[PDB]
Structures are given as structure tokens and as C-alpha cells.
Design a protein around this ligand. Structure first.
Ligand SMILES: [Ca+2]
Ligand SMILES: [Ca+2]
Length: 279
């Protein structure tokens, strides 16, 4: 299956070179898999979700996404036009308020919810968690994400937008999960993206067009944009049966475009997420 004039991020994860515009992917498109978007909530009524997105838990007065960040990331995972796995199930866990901030104990509770809620859903191909958030280091937040990954969920988290080493940021510094850095359309590391040994993979992060609240679309930048790319890629690869939740991050690093990114500091992996699809 091919989508022409795809967002540059989708065309890049299906190509070995930059500057393409077609996103190639298997037509299974993540059918049978689930992705929890642990963010500001999802506007499930957005036409681009086709009724495949729903809110399952909120920690605030409403499950409505008043920010739009959670909808943008849910779009990059599995929206029709802006989504990697165009046929995946999207579950909205709202751990942040409409300003985009939240407490660690709420984010930790939101991660423990996913580890239990997945036993009530039908996701035979597997379950993925996209965590487009982060702050200072927290051993309890790190152990929370380690708990989520240990329960059988592919945990993709953002590396942070501090232009610094991601060892000082949680849950980015938790080694058991998938820590995703950001790159731009010219195969440079995004100027904001964090780096370091703890990073596992890079994804398209700068100027990512996806869904927004009010049924609209907009393009934004951040490592929180590259994380849904990898989370949607994991669901895509898990539906194809090529990997499991416990091994998806290592598999994505195994089959990634090696050495394609510039501005990669020494000690940081030079791997860019790549679906390796051959039509
Ligand atoms: Ca190349
Ligand atoms: Ca890791």
C-alpha cells in the first residue's frame, strides 16, 4: 500500500533516503494492535481517527483534549492521513491537563493503569504505549515505565527537547524502554533533541503535521512528535508478526537506517526508524 504526498515523517520511515513523499506500508496497517497514548487526551471524534480512537482514563475533570498535543500524537500513531499504523486501535490516557503539564504521581498512576487495562481490551497482535512527555530524573517514574514494559507493553518514550544528555530525564533515562530522539527532514538531528547512550532510535520530530483539536490539523516539533512515529511503527511491526512487545525496540534498532543522521554526538546511536517494507 502507498500513500502519496504523505507527511515527510511518514515518507521517511518507509525510505532509505531523505527527500521522498510516498509512505509505503503493508495494508495490514497495525490491524489487531493497540496503542495507549499517555498524553493530554485524544479528540476521539476527529474524522481522521475513523472511530478507532477512544478515551479510556482521565485524571482530570474531563476526558476532553483541551490542549491538542495528545490528539497530535494519537494522529501520528494511527490517523488515516498522518498515522504510521493506519488501522490500529488508539486508547487515550489523559495524564496531563489542558496546559500540557502534570504531576509525576499522576503520570505514574497513568502508567500503572495501562499495565492493567490492557487485560480488558482485545489486542491480539500486542499493546504499545506512546509517552510523549518528560521532566527531570525520577527513579519512581523510571521504575513505573519499567513496570509498564515488563507487563508486556512496548513503551516508547520521548528523549526530551533540552539539547542535553537524556540520562538526566525521566522516563527517558529508563534503559528498559524505547527512548526516541528527533530528526528533521534533512536527516539532521533535531536541534532540540536530547542525545546520549540511553537513546535507542531516532524518528521524524521536526515539523510533523498531524491531527489537532476541533477536527483540524497543524504541524509542530519536538521529540514528543518522533515518539508516536516509533510507537506506531512498533504496532505496525507487531501486527505483521515480525516482533513482540518485549523485543520491538531492539528489533526497530536492528532494522533501522544506520548512519544516515548528521549532528549525532559520539556515543549516541545513529539509527533512524525504518519499516523496511518491500512492495
Ligand atoms: Ca540512506
Ligand atoms: Ca532502551
Amino acid at each position: 500500500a502507498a500513500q502519496t504526498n504523505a507527511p515527510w515523517g511518514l515518507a521517511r520511515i518507509s525510505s532509505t533516503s531523505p527527500g521522498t513523499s510516498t509512505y509505503y506500508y503493508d495494508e495490514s496497517a497495525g490491524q489487531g494492535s493497540c496503542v495507549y497514548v499517555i498524553d493530554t487526551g485524544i479528540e476521539a471524534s476527529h474524522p481522521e481517527f475513523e472511530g478507532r480512537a477512544q478515551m479510556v482514563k482521565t485524571y482530570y475533570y474531563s476526558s476532553r483534549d483541551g490542549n491538542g498535543h495528545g490528539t497530535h500524537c494519537a494522529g501520528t500513531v494511527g490517523s488515516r492521513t498522518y498515522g504510521v499504523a493506519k488501522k490500529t486501535q488508539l486508547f487515550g490516557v489523559k495524564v496531563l491537563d489542558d496546559n500540557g503539564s502534570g504531576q509525576y504521581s499522576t503520570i505514574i498512576a497513568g502508567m500503572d493503569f495501562v499495565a492493567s487495562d490492557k487485560n480488558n481490551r482485545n489486542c491480539p497482535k500486542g499493546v504499545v504505549a506512546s509517552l510523549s512527555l518528560g521532566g527531570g530524573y525520577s527513579s519512581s517514574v523510571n521504575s513505573a515505565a519499567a513496570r509498564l514494559q515488563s507487563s508486556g507493553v512496548m513503551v516508547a518514550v520521548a528523549a526530551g527537547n533540552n539539547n542535553a544528555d537524556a540520562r538526566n530525564y525521566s522516563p527517558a533515562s529508563e534503559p528498559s524502554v524505547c527512548t526516541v530522539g528527533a530528526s528533521d527532514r534533512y536527516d539532521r538531528r533535531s536541534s532540540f533533541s536530547n542525545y546520549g547512550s540511553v537513546l535507542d532510535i531516532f524518528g521524524p520530530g521536526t515539523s510533523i503535521l498531524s491531527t489537532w483539536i476541533g477536527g483540524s490539523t497543524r504541524s509542530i516539533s519536538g521529540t514528543s512528535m518522533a515518539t508516536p512515529h516509533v510507537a506506531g511503527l512498533a504496532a505496525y511491526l507487531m501486527t505483521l508478526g515480525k516482533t513482540t512487545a518485549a523485543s520491538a525496540c531492539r528489533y526497530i534498532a536492528d532494522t533501522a537506517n544506520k548512519g544516515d543522521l548528521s549532528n549525532i554526538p559520539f556515543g549516541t546511536v545513529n539509527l533512524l526508524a525504518y519499516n523496511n517494507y518491500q512492495a
